[PDB]
């Protein structure tokens, strides 16, 4: 329906018959796109600005299975497992660089990719409804046995699909071998799917051939015994099978997926699978056996029970799936929703246990992207690009409940620190405006104290809400607020001064209690000597700090623009508190320039100290707007004078978006259709220039000698820095 790509030169590869495909990411950057071009390379693509598609050559054949673990970029490269797991961590998130972290499964073919790190978060959404719980009961975490802790470590241990015993030789971040050999029941044959995270620190696996027989090689295995050894268990869990063969009519089902979910108590995805469609579901409800009929008159045993089964019409399954045991009456979001695309055109997305019907709007392998119902188009139609359908959470309309669910999932994404893509699900930003208003209100009132660690993130979140449209004002305003706050905050504790009664930054913070003008007075009024750190500080003022100077300049000219066709115009910046923070920055950079002549002046004229008059006008407007002040006093008329010193042409970092409203968005693989400030930005490109999409637009090596503070401080993900991209320069 919407969000479809295409590949110009490549096609369905009519020469090769076919190849099984797979991909799955529960975190950001969830595109892997196993395919065959016209063995083949593996692709990675982000959710925003998918124009810059990337790929990288593999080193094996048939690329059968891959599934990441955490936000840390990684992949599996199964199917004889050549070039095993690693990170990217080179300059950005657009190059594989598979390191020496390789596990040599000699000439095998497993289909297992699992062993995550920690517990699944608990969500009492229906009960709590996030009224005033303050993330206490609304978002919790159930105690869960960490797999082979020592601090939770983790490895890529899997199960031999081709083989029949086990995987060994684990070397997680220790470069140690630890080689052994185990028997593992001395017999087996499997074509199973893995289900790892169970109650104890064990792994579960069961399937052999299909509906023909009824074998399940349940292997309850234990790995944590002692360092430099392995004792893999061979505990055979109680077997089971697909009761579909009970029909005396026919038995041709032959399942081929039988996948599970991370909750190993309440699902069994057996299904009749050319010329058939019949889902099945069983549980692990422990119960005693009817020991009777032996005469006139350990009960603990496990015998599976049915959950759900019916006749359907479908060919391909995608993925199985909050917590259960909740009367989800008022809940209509995809809570534990299991959907799968239907071959015959439209996609009948419907939750479990009903399967009846939903809205359709008449006249290979997939996985669920996230809570927002936007699937990936890898259905049984050949080498076709991705698709998306309506994420409508339920039949009826409920704006109140809608925004409630939206804020619930937003706060969940905030506390879990994952990516957010509920963009397509929300209506135009007016409702989103009310939502963010209510959100910041609840944040301020019932934080209660997590604010001091949760503020920055949600500000960036705000950006997303203000990203789509007419309301581009809050976007730029929040970007400047965030960058200024961050830079000033990091500049504060960078003083190797001599100790005093209180901290240097803390004592500088109280500068609010000072007169209006003549900063040269207040600076010596508080302290002058203990502010110099070292001679090698002549790299920040003339190069990067100049920004803030120009910044305040850009305020002046933008002050008398209330009559413009934009209520805040470019920005308003009438908060006062942030303004006071900037004024503190001004006085500290003033004493800095007093300590070194390489500061940032007006650069134009009237030097015989423009900075002084600039600062006094800023303090004037501040005190005129600190505690519920007026806006446009008579002083506004005089400060509105344009002194011959203001420069222009500033970055004001921003990015495009995906305005796919309702109908269709068709793009190619390339050639998109329309619709750190340490210098490092000339007219034409001059280096590799590894940039980012949020605001960054910076250089890769930073081309410096001792300014490593900022560079090292921003080597990793920047402010919402998942969009650290790269692109070479043009050539004639």
């Amino acid at each position: 329906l919407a969000y479809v790509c295409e590949w110009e030169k490549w096609a369905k590869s009519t020469y090769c018959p076919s190849l099984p495909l797979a991909c799955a990411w529960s975190c950001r950057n969830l595109i892997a796109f196993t395919t065959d071009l016209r063995t083949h390379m593996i692709h990675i693509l982000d959710t925003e600005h998918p124009w810059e598609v990337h790929s990288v050559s593999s080193g094996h054949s048939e690329a059968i299975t891959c599934l990441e673990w955490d936000q840390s970029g990684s992949r599996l490269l199964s199917a004889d497992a050549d070039g095993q797991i690693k990170c990217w961590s080179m300059a950005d998130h657009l190059a594989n660089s598979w390191e020496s972290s390789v596990g040599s499964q000699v000439e095998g073919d497993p289909i297992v990719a699992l062993s995550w790190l920690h517990n699944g978060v608990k969500l009492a959404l229906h009960v709590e409804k996030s009224g005033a719980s303050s993330f206490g009961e609304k978002f919790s975490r159930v105690k869960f046995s960490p797999s082979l802790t020592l601090k939770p470590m983790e490895g890529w241990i899997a199960v031999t699909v081709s083989g029949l015993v086990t995987v060994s030789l684990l070397k997680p971040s220790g470069q140690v071998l630890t080689s052994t050999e185990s028997l593992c029941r001395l017999r087996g044959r499997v074509a199973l799917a893995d289900i790892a995270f169970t109650g104890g620190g064990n792994i579960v696996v069961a399937a052999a051939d299909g509906s023909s027989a009824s074998p399940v090689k349940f292997y309850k295995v234990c790995v944590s015994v002692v360092s430099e050894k392995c004792r893999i268990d061979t505990e055979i869990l109680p077997s089971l099978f697909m009761r579909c063969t009970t029909d005396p009519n026919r038995k041709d089902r032959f399942p081929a997926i039988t996948h599970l979910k991370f909750l190993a108590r309440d699902m069994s995805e057996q299904v009749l699978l050319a010329t058939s469609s019949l889902v099945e579901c069983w549980s692990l409800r422990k119960e005693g056996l009817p020991v009777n009929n032996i005469f006139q008159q350990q009960p603990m045993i496990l015998k599976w029970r049915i959950l759900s089964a019916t006749n359907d019409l479908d060919r391909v399954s995608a993925v199985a799936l909050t917590d259960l045991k909740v009367a989800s009456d008022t809940q209509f979001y995809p809570g534990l929703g299991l959907a799968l695309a239907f071959q015959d055109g439209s996609v009948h997305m419907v939750h479990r246990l009903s399967l009846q019907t939903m809205a359709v709007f008449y006249s290979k392998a997939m996985q669920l992207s996230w809570t927002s119902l936007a699937l990936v188009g890898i259905d049984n139609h050949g080498k076709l690009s991705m698709l998306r359908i309506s994420p409508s959470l339920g039949h009826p309309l409920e704006p109140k409940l809608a925004l409630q669910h939206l804020l619930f999932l937003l706060e969940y994404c905030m506390v879990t620190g994952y990516d957010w893509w509920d963009i397509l699900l929300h209506v135009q930003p007016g409702m989103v405006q009310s939502l963010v208003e209510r959100l910041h209100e609840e944040y301020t009132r019932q934080k209660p104290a997590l604010q001091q660690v949760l503020s920055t993130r949600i500000l960036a979140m705000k950006a997303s809400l203000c990203k789509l449209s007419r309301v581009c004002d809050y976007h730029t305003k929040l970007f400047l607020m965030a960058i200024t706050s961050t830079l000033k905050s990091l500049l504060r504790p960078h003083f190797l001064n001599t100790p005093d009664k209180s901290p240097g930054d803390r004592l500088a913070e109280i500068c609010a209690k000072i007169t209006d003008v003549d900063i040269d007075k207040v600076m010596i009024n508080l302290k002058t000597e203990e502010f110099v750190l070292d001679m090698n500080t002549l790299q920040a003022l003339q190069q990067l700090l100049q920004w803030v100077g120009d910044f305040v300049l850009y305020l002046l000219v933008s002050l008398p623009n209330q009559g413009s066709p934009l209520r805040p115009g470019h920005s308003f910046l009438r908060d006062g508190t942030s303004l006071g923070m900037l004024r503190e920055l001004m006085v500290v950079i003033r004493i800095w320039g007093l300590l070194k002549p390489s500061c940032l002046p007006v650069y134009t004229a009237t030097s015989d100290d423009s900075m002084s008059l600039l600062f006094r006008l800023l303090t004037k407007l501040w005190i005129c707007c600190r505690d519920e002040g007026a806006a446009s006093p008579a002083s506004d008329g005089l400060v509105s004078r344009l002194q011959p010193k203001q420069p222009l042409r500033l970055r004001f970092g921003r990015a495009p978006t995906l305005p796919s409203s309702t109908s269709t968005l068709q793009l190619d693989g390339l050639t998109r259709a329309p619709g750190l400030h340490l210098g490092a930005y000339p007219t034409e490109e001059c280096k590799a220039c590894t940039r980012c999409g949020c605001v960054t637009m910076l250089k890769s090596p930073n081309k410096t000698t001792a300014v490593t503070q900022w560079e090292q401080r921003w080597i990793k993900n920047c402010l919402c820095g998942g969009l650290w991209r790269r692109v070479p320069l043009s050539c004639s």
Partner: protein
Amino acid sequence: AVAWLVAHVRMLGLDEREKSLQMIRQLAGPLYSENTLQFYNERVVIMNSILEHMCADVLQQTATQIKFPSTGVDTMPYWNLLPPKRPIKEVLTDIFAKVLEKGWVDSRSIHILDTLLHMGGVYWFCNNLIKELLKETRKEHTLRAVQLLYSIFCLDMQQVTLVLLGHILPGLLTDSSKWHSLMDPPGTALAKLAVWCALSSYSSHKGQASSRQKKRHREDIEDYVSLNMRDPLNRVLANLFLLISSILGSRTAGPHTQFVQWFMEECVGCLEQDSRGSILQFMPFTTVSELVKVSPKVVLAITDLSLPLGRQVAAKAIA
């Protein structure tokens, strides 16, 4: 009792009541206790023992070994014999090298091979086989190898040949990475292999085995675009021949020109009936015209039934 013990072994083995039950049942308990008017207790007990031996294999494997209630002479030696603490990547260096150095197929080991067949996948089976094949670097050894290999492909002819013709030939011809292998004189054997398996498959073949008929239910359309019937083997052969004709195209031929040359050469054979060559808008005629530039070999192949279609290729072969 044995059958239901085999049914109940699917538990956690924490009770193991049926194990001791079967052990008691297999004992010498009935030593003329009741008025057993049989007079054949000896042979009956021998049959009971041999039947208990043939079944209960999984129970005598998944649990502790029995206390040897056999007291026989020599039980069935044929078994899995798969080294537990060893991967499946052993067939080549343990079987193929020996059988090439030996003079016969080592019938016993064949049983093992059978277990190897319906255990993994035919795809990777034939893949690793042909991979281990190209190492002799001498025509005689490659000849003996493919000779033994045509035989080892028996008991699974239909599906194995289908998977081969579908993947293993495009798996090298389609790309240039695997082209390196095709240049070898083993390539001639590979061509002989291909034509032999194609001939055997196209020929009448029932192939009805228990472990095969019980495991001969899948789904596959092969996505064989057509741009005298609808049979998987025939369709796969048509797609294969179309790809041969395509590879016979110009602008690049280092290793594969010799491959298609050897293919066409070995295809020439008396008493054969393959290469039907549909004559509506297909390549085989232009293919023969081009192969003539590499004399009367194709002049005999293309002559399907002396139809007026064959007049064209005849005139072209006139030269």
